[PDB]
Design a protein around this ligand. Structure first.
Ligand SMILES: Cn1cnc(Cn2c(=O)nc(Nc3cc4cn(C)nc4cc3Cl)n(Cc3cc(F)c(F)cc3F)c2=O)n1
Lengths: 185, 9
């Protein structure tokens, strides 16, 4: 059994940088997404993220909530997450907190594609910090959460599928669960 | 020096 997803659906956006696109989480006036978005196809194998960050300006990020483009007015990098400051606060921001979970704990995942919610299901973090999720291409940036009364606890942001078909990602401060790095190897 | 990566919607 997963938690009802309504409170999280209203926070999902699409983030595009050049030709690279994925999902972002829009809370108050900040959009959180995997920093992998600043890679072109050539960069994805061995990215130098500090150097790519320097090359990008605010107007190189295209953030879309449905059909509405949001203006990016600042950007910063925190571990493996990018934080995009936008000029509009999300009117559907629920009460929320960020938390880091442990192996054995379960959470709900809202799988999204190109900024649009697609399905909801429950996962468990395995002892080696991977999860056996149900994720296809385009799902990078999908989030996992629990509901604690009126409060949404965001605990997981999806980054990558590993060669054996399990999945790996970060907490909402950009720190990986497990000994992984955000590169296409 | 400006990034010239083509944007695709
Ligand atoms: C099969 N599967 C299950 N989960 C996933 C998640 N996932 C994803 O959705 N996309 C990825 N790479 C991208 C390719 C792109 C092509 N375009 C045009 N835009 C793209 C954006 C992304 Cl993110 N990847 C791979 C991946 C993503 C990372 F964030 C990372 F750090 C390393 C990686 F190898 C991916 O796993 N796919």
């Amino acid at each position: 059994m997963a938690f009802p997803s309504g409170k999280v659906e209203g926070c999902m956006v699409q983030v595009t940088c050049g030709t690279t696109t994925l999902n972002g989480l829009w809370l108050d006036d900040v959009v959180y997404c995997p920093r992998h978005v600043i890679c072109t196809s050539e960069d994805m194998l061995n990215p130098n993220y500090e150097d790519l960050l320097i090359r990008k300006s605010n107007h190189n990020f295209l953030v879309q909530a449905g059909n509405v483009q949001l203006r990016v007015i600042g950007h910063s990098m925190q571990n493996c997450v990018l934080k995009l400051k936008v000029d509009t606060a999300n009117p559907k921001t629920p009460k929320y907190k960020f938390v880091r979970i442990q192996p054995g704990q379960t959470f709900s995942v809202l799988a999204c594609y190109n900024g649009s919610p697609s399905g909801v299901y429950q996962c468990a973090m395995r002892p080696n910090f991977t999860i056996k999720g149900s994720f296809l291409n385009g799902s990078c940036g999908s989030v996992g959460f629990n509901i604690d009364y009126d409060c949404v606890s965001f605990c997981y942001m999806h980054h990558m599928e590993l060669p054996t078909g399990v999945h790996a990602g970060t907490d909402l401060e950009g720190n990986f669960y497990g000994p992984f790095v955000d590169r296409q190897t | 020096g400006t990034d010239t990566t083509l944007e695709h919607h």
